[PDB]
Design a protein around this ligand. Sequence first.
Ligand SMILES: *[C@@H]1O[C@H](CO[C@@H]2O[C@@H](C)[C@@H](O)[C@@H](O)[C@@H]2O)[C@@H](O[C@@H]2O[C@H](CO)[C@@H](O[C@@H]3O[C@H](CO[C@H]4O[C@H](CO)[C@@H](O)[C@H](O)[C@@H]4O[C@@H]4O[C@H](CO)[C@@H](O)[C@H](O)[C@H]4NC(C)=O)[C@@H](O[C@@H]4O[C@H](CO)[C@@H](O)[C@H](O)[C@H]4NC(C)=O)[C@H](O[C@H]4O[C@H](CO)[C@@H](O)[C@H](O)[C@@H]4O[C@@H]4O[C@H](CO)[C@@H](O)[C@H](O)[C@H]4NC(C)=O)[C@@H]3O)[C@H](O)[C@H]2NC(C)=O)[C@H](O)[C@H]1NC(C)=O
Ligand SMILES: [Ca+2]
Ligand SMILES: [Ca+2]
Ligand SMILES: [Ca+2]
Ligand SMILES: [Zn+2]
Length: 415
Amino acid sequence: NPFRFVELVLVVDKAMVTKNNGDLDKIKTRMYEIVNTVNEIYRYMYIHVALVGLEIWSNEDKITVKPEAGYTLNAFGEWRKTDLLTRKKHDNAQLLTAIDLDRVIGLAYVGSMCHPKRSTGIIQDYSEINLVVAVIMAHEMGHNLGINHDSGYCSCGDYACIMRPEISPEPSTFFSNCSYFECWDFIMNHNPECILNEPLGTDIISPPVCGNELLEVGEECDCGTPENCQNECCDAATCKLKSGSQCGHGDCCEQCKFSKSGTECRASMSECDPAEHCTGQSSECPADVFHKNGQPCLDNYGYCYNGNCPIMYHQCYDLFGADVYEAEDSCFERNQKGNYYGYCRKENGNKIPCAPEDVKCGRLYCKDNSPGQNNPCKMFYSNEDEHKGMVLPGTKCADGKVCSNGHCVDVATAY
Ligand SMILES: *[C@@H]1O[C@H](CO[C@@H]2O[C@@H](C)[C@@H](O)[C@@H](O)[C@@H]2O)[C@@H](O[C@@H]2O[C@H](CO)[C@@H](O[C@@H]3O[C@H](CO[C@H]4O[C@H](CO)[C@@H](O)[C@H](O)[C@@H]4O[C@@H]4O[C@H](CO)[C@@H](O)[C@H](O)[C@H]4NC(C)=O)[C@@H](O[C@@H]4O[C@H](CO)[C@@H](O)[C@H](O)[C@H]4NC(C)=O)[C@H](O[C@H]4O[C@H](CO)[C@@H](O)[C@H](O)[C@@H]4O[C@@H]4O[C@H](CO)[C@@H](O)[C@H](O)[C@H]4NC(C)=O)[C@@H]3O)[C@H](O)[C@H]2NC(C)=O)[C@H](O)[C@H]1NC(C)=O
Ligand SMILES: [Ca+2]
Ligand SMILES: [Ca+2]
Ligand SMILES: [Ca+2]
Ligand SMILES: [Zn+2]
C-alpha cells in the first residue's frame, strides 16, 4: 500500500461559534464535509486524511486567539503538545478561527508533520464556500508536509493549484506536480512515521462516508467512487463486497479471498523479529510480535532491541559498505571531546561529551582495511542529520552491556 494517512484533529475557536450563532450541529456538519473534501484533494498525493477528533471551544478559547498569526500559531502549537496530544493521539491539528487575521488568512510550520508542536496550522474561516476553506486547510497541511508555494512553470492543468501564494477566487482541488514531488521528497528524506498507520474505523469521529476511500465502521469495503474504484471485490456504489468475496482489503486478502493459512504477511526484520503469518480465516495480519529485548542475538554479538540486533559491525557496513569494520577502542575516545561529532547525547540542544565509560555509545568509528587508506577512525557526520552515524541504541557496547541514551549499561538493568 502506497497511501499515507493523516490522522487529523480540528479545533474550532469561540469566534467561530459566535459566528454560527451557537449552532454546534451546523459547525460539526460543515467540518465533516470540509475534511471530506480535503481528503479528496489529497487523493492525488497518495495521502488520506481522516478526522479523528473535533474540539469546539464554545465556552472559552484554551489559548488567546490573536489576529497576529505568529503568536496564535505558536500558542496553538504549545497547546497541542502540552494539552491536546496528551489526551488524544493524532498526527496533525488545525485551528479554524473566525477572527480576521493580520495580512494572512492562514499560517503553518513547514515540513513538521508529526512534530508534537509544529505539526499544526491555523486557518481563518475566510469564506462560506466550503471548497475555499477546504483548500486553505489543505494548503496549510501542505506546508506541514514540507510543501512550499508554487512558482514558475508548476502546473495542475489550467486550474489554480492548492499551493499558490494566495488563494484563488475560483479555487480547484488539484495540487501542482511540484507539490507532489516536493511532498514525497519530504516523506523520503525526513520520515513522518506517524502517518504510516491506517486509522481504524472507530478512530474516525466523522459520520462514515461510502466512497471516500476510507474503510469506516459499518462498511465492508470502500474503493472510492464507482469511477475510481479499482477493487474487484468491492461494489463502490454501496461499499458492500461482491457476493462470494471473503474480504476486500488487508495484507491477508488475495483476490477477494483470505490468504492461505501460513502465508507470510509481515516479514522478519531480524532474528529478534519473528514474522507473522495469515491465519486463513481473516484478511488482517496478526499483531507485530518482537522477541524480548536483551535476548542474545547474532551468535552472541548483540542483544535484541525492539525487533532488531544492532551491532558495531553491521552499523559500520550500513555507512561505508562492505569490507569495513569497527575501529579500535582508542578511536572511540574522540567522543569525550564533546565537539560537533564526538559526543554521547544531546541536552536541550547541547552536545554532551561521553564519559570514559560510555565512550562506545557515542559517535561510531570504523576502520578501513583497504590499500594505503590510512584513516583508522573513519566516522560519519552531516549537520543535515547529526544522529546519522551515531551508535544505535541497544548496541552491545561491552560484554553484558548495551547502549542506552548514550550510556553503556548492563543489559539486565537496561530493560
Ligand atoms: C511540472 O509539469 C510542468 C508541465 O505542465 C504541462 O503544461 C501545463 C500547462 C499543464 O497542461 C500540464 O498538464 C502539463 O503537464 C512542467 O513545465 C515545464 O517547465 C519547464 C521549466 O521547468 C518549462 O520550460 C521553460 O519554458 C520557458 C518558457 O518558454 C516556453 O514558452 C515561450 C513563450 O510562450 C516559448 O517562446 C518557448 O518556445 C517555450 O515553449 C515551450 O517549448 C517547449 C519545448 O520542449 C514545449 O514543450 C512547450 O510546450 C512550449 N510551451 C509553450 C509556452 O508553448 C522558458 O523561458 C523562455 O526562455 C526563452 C529563451 O529560451 C526566453 O527568450 C523567454 O523570455 C522565456 N520565457 C519566459 C516567459 O520566461 C524556459 O527557458 C529559459 O529558462 C531556462 C531555465 O529552465 C534556461 O535554461 C534557458 O536559458 C531559458 O532562458 C533563460 O531563462 C532564465 C530564467 O531561468 C532567464 O533569466 C534568462 O534571461 C533566459 N535567457 C534567455 C535564453 O533569454 C524553459 O524552456 C516548460 O515550458 C514547461 N512546460 C510546459 C508545458 O509549460 C514543470 O517543469 C514540471 N515541474 C516539475 C519539476 O515537476
Ligand atoms: Ca497516524
Ligand atoms: Ca468510507
Ligand atoms: Ca513480527
Ligand atoms: Zn502558504
